[PDB]
Amino acid sequence: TGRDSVTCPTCQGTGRIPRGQENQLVALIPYSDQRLRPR
Amino acid sequence: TGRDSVTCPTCQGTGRIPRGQENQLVALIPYSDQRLRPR
Ligand SMILES: [Zn+2]
């Protein structure tokens, strides 16, 4: 049992949404996830 | 590999959001999920 809540009516509680670059650009870049500190 | 997408910046891709009754009331009610047709 738990509090009352409904699944995301947008992402259907999946965990994936379209970036907002169109509205506001970004200032980041991709990289490689080395073994060191995987978490 | 897959298309580019970011996790829900609201539900953090968890799958739980506050209902919108405050904005718009509802006209539904709870019930029991009998064994017949579980899906
Ligand atoms: Zn979501």
Side-chain angles (χ1 to χ4, degrees), chain A residues 19 25-33:
Chain A
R19 310 219 200 170
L25 57 84
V26 291
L28 63 88
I29 45 174
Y31 267 119
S32 305
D33 203 63

Side-chain angles (χ1 to χ4, degrees), chain B residues 1-18:
Chain B
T1 184
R3 292 190 85 77
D4 282 340
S5 313
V6 304
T7 306
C8 230
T10 53
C11 78
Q12 296 196 109
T14 63
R16 267 209 269 290
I17 71 116

